[PDB]
């Protein structure tokens, strides 16, 4: 067993290098030539807030077992993940690093690293995917606390102590670092924003939200305090080991990749725990645009299967909003979910309604009887209030997916509404501008209906359609229904 | 004295009508022909929330004196305001309607209405403006509670009881209805949103804010509950009369059209009262774009004088943010403010800092050291994050004035920032894309400076300028000094 600085990086990495003239992105979907240039312990900037660079935690923190799974990872990136852990963490807090080789083409990628101090390697004899691989790692772990990292990460100064501090104080917290960006083209390490929380739209794809002005203001007195998050990104977190077991590890029937992050985030919050992001903890990650590995048969389908297994167990009736956003998912078989359902009963978990009200209230939820919801899209433009109020006109701007002035619903009462304002046909003459007015369920001037395969909006009882041809020179108008592009409108969710 | 239904509207309105072929907007800056077609008690839609319409309102409440000032108002609109009051209010809660004629060309506009039940008319023998006219009304009022309305309003069903209920319970509350819109072109009555609060930017012009999602969510259990507001619109409110007197009425040296809404909003909050908007109370108002009457000083100048008189008395050091937004105001003389200052002392009022923290915390305060702020404009386009985060590119979209992804600052550290992200020159080679990264004062790659009369942005220590030529095919770039940008 070799102390990390004595490990021969050139011997390990050299041999798998990008050959003369070949594409440096093909193998990993990031620039391997640029990754291979880097020293295994290369210096990276300290991206932590000023206050971190002196703050503290307790003096007897529990040690962790670090679990890293990989499938055909670049040697330089894997080695660098491992040495960033050994170099930036106090030695007495690292029990071991468990490398789970998830059936990589070449078993030596992992096995050679078993020589390094504290490194244990476990090879799957067939392809299992990240969820079953992580669980194999967790099951072999000796320490009280688990840490999971992707196999292309780089830990920053004092990344670990702030995470451990939290779970040592309360074992029901599941905590993550702020995840810095390692650029997939040049491999520069870039400090991420600290003003983000995790979230998602009704398609159940993970996304980053800025905190609200109210949240930011409440933190002014301690800007590096933990941030409660509705959802974690999923690959980098720290969790009490026994808590991970009690809560049901991961769903063993999810395959390859995607959205075990979704499942575990719902399960923790609904079943009594919490999720946090810890600003003083910084870890870089190579974000990429495409997967470099295979999905039996097809990433689209696997992601939908996994997502369905989460939705059908945890979301109660609100799963129907997911299927409204992704109707093709209804045709994807997802297998037996019984033991996951029995797990939910056994833990006494709160309903998803509770999660929405108390954990993710800023996720905008359609009324139970809404016909459609979300943005109203025309090409790359969206229906927009233009910041106007009652008696004001309405327009378009480029879709920004931030909601706000581009958020609308088609109600049970057949009205197109934003807040308590409704699109109102004030004058039936073609070319007349429409106005925003307070919604009046009786008012027939506010009634609209989808037509032509939910591609347009017609004013009920007329041959008038919503039309953008006047948008920049007065506002949206009512015009005789006809084949123009300016009369095409689609909602992002359709019930 | 005549009951309102017996009043001869055609006789009153019918001499003063828009003559054949003449401009129907000239006299009032709204469509008089369309106003004159309407019956004095014309039906209007009930715009109240469902819950309001089921409530049975208390009627064992203090009566009010309604004060309405006017200067050359259209007869049809003034009559209609008066009858909406008499028709929609329980008779025992109307003590009187005091019409303050602020030196209208024709005194008969007001005097002919003195025949109507409960109407008293007071004529100013010279032009005094709305603030002094309202005070004259208040001074003459016999009831315990004052109600002020503009002379072109229309009260809706059970508009009054919900307002009186609040001040009867606590006399330090100053309360307003939701103000519906009477369209200045067609005179249709239109229901306003109930999700607004009053506010202002540092230029001290009144504006409407939507409540936050959080505020709206807290009210889900009682959606017609009072809404606390940092500021009232100013023309429609109800206030305990003795409270109005003790707090100092209005500043008698403000002229014409103020400013006075700002002053009284600050004074009430800082000096121990509150401001509310009451959803179950609905009153329509003819909003217009221009004033139809004369301003001796301004209008630009009188508005600034009045606003000064408020700022200098109430805002402490924060007045300097007003002057930073409206530097021309520093040259406007505003007269003696001594008795207003003595009033503030006498009442033991809290400082403006308290008001910002406790009443209007959402007003963004440039506690500095910012060099510039707002949108970064190029033609009709604006600098836009494109919803991107750290290590992402940056671009342009059409300016929308909604802030969000088009909001930026130029800091004391000379960085161009959105939230805690900064425009970063990642590569000095001309044509290189710039990226968003976490702000570090250090990173000399993040430093920018305005040049050529604040018309461009140059990267400090280089001959590189910010450039949009690549915007739609990669993002904003750095290029040798599409390079025009203004905050």
């Amino acid at each position: 067993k070799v102390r990390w600085p004595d490990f021969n990086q050139e011997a390990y990495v050299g041999g798998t290098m990008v050959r003369s003239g070949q594409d440096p992105y093909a193998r990993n979907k990031f620039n391997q030539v640029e990754s291979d240039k880097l020293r295994m312990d290369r210096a990276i900037p300290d991206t932590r807030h000023d206050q971190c660079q002196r703050k503290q935690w307790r003096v007897d923190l529990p040690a962790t077992s670090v679990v890293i799974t990989f499938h055909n990872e670049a040697r330089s990136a894997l080695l660098r993940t491992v040495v960033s852990v050994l170099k930036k963490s106090p030695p007495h807090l690292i029990k071991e690093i468990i490398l789970v080789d998830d059936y990589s083409n070449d078993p030596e990628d992992g096995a050679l690293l078993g020589k390094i101090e504290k490194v244990r390697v476990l090879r799957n004899d067939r392809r299992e995917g990240l969820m079953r691989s992580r669980v194999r790692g967790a099951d072999a772990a000796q320490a009280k606390v688990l840490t999971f990292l992707d196999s292309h990460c780089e830990c920053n100064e004092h990344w670990l102590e702030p995470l451990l501090e939290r779970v040592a104080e309360d074992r029901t917290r599941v905590v993550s670092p702020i995840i810095d960006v390692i650029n997939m083209d040049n491999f520069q390490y870039v400090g991420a924003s600290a003003d983000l929380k995790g979230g998602f739209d009704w398609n159940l794809v993970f996304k980053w939200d800025y905190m609200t002005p109210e949240q930011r203001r409440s933190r002014q007195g301690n800007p590096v305090a933990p941030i409660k998050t509705p959802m974690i990104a999923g690959g980098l977190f720290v969790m009490d080991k026994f808590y991970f077991e009690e809560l049901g590890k991961y769903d063993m029937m999810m395959d390859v990749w995607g959205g075990e992050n979704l499942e575990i985030s719902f399960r923790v919050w609904q079943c009594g725990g919490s999720l946090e992001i810890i600003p003083c903890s910084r870890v870089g990650h190579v974000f990429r645009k495409q997967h470099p590995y295979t999905f039996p048969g097809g990433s689209g389908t696997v992601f939908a299967r996994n997502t369905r297994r989460a939705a059908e167990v945890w979301m109660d009736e609100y799963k129907n909003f997911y299927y409204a956003a992704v109707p093709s998912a209804r045709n994807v078989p997802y297998g037996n979910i019984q033991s996951r359902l029995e797990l939910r009963k056994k833990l006494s978990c709160k309903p998803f309604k509770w999660y929405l009200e108390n954990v993710y209230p800023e996720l905008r939820v359609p009324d139970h009887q809404d016909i459609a919801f979300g943005a109203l899209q025309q090409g790359t433009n969206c229906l927009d209030t233009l910041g106007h109020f009652a008696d004001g006109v309405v327009g378009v701007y480029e879709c920004h997916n931030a909601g706000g002035n581009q958020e609308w619903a088609l109600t049970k009462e057949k009205s197109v509404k934003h807040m308590d304002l409704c699109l109102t046909v004030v004058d039936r003459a073609p070319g007349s501008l429409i106005k925003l007015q307070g919604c009046r369920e009786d008012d027939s001037r506010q009634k609209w209906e989808q037509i032509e395969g939910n591609s347009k909006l017609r004013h009920v009882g007329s041959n008038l359609c919503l039309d953008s041809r006047t948008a920049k020179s007065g506002g949206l108008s009512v015009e005789v229904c006809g084949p123009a592009l300016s009369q095409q409108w689609k909602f992002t969710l359709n019930l | 004295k005549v009951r309102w239904p017996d009043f001869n509207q055609e006789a009153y309105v019918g001499g003063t009508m828009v003559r054949s072929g003449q401009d129907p907007y000239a006299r009032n800056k709204f469509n008089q022909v369309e106003s004159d077609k309407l019956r004095m008690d014309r039906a209007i839609p009930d715009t109240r929330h469902d819950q309001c319409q089921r409530k049975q309102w208390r009627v064992d409440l203090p009566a009010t004196s309604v004060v309405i000032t006017f200067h050359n108002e259209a007869r049809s609109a003034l009559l209609r305001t008066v009858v909406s009051v008499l028709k929609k209010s329980p008779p025992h809660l109307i003590k009187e309607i005091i019409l303050v004629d602020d030196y209208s060309n024709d005194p008969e506009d007001g005097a002919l209405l003195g025949k109507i039940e409960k109407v008293r008319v007071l004529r100013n023998d010279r032009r005094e403006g709305l603030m002094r006219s309202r005070v004259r009304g208040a001074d003459a009022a016999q009831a315990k509670v004052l109600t002020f309305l503009d002379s072109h309003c229309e009260c809706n069903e059970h508009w009054l009881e919900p307002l009186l209920e609040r001040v009867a319970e606590d006399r330090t509350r100053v309360v307003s209805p939701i103000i519906d819109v009477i369209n200045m072109d067609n005179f249709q009555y239109v229901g306003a949103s109930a999700d607004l609060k009053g506010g202002f930017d540092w230029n001290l012009v009144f504006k409407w804010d939507y409540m936050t999602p959080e505020q709206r969510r807290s009210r889900q259990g009682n959606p017609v509950a009072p809404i606390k507001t940092p500021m009232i619109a100013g023309g429609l409110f109800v206030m305990d009369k003795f409270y109005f007197e003790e707090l100092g009425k209005y500043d008698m040296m403000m002229d014409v059209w103020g400013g006075e809404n700002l002053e009284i909003s600050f004074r009430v909050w800082q000096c121990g009262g509150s401001l509310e908007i009451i959803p179950c109370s609905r009153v329509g108002h003819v909003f217009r774009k221009q004033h139809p009457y004369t301003f001796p000083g301004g209008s630009g100048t009188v508005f600034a004088r009045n606003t000064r008189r408020a700022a200098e008395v109430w805002m402490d050091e924060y007045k300097n943010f007003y002057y930073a937004a409206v530097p021309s105001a520093r040259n406007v003389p505003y007269g003696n403010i001594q008795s207003r200052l003595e009033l503030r002392k006498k009442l033991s009022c809290k400082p403006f800092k308290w008001y910002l923290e406790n009443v209007y915390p959402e007003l963004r305060v440039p506690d500095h050291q910012d060099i510039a702020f707002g949108a970064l404009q190029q033609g009709t386009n604006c600098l836009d994050t494109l919803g991107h985060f750290a290590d992402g590119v940056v671009g342009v979209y059409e300016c929308h004035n909604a802030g969000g992804n088009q909001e930026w600052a130029l800091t004391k550290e000379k960085s161009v920032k959105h939230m805690d992200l900064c425009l970063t020159v990642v590569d000095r080679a001309p044509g290189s894309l710039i990226k968003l990264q976490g702000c570090r004062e250090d990173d000399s790659r993040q430093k920018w400076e305005q040049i050529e009369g604040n018309s461009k942005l140059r990267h400090v220590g280089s001959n590189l300028c910010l450039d949009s030529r690549t915007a739609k095919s990669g993002g904003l770039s750095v290029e040798v000094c599409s390079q025009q940008w203004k905050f």
Partner: peptide, 7 residues
């Protein structure tokens, strides 16, 4: 389909 996106 597509990976975990960038902060």
């Amino acid at each position: 389909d597509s990976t975990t996106p960038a902060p």
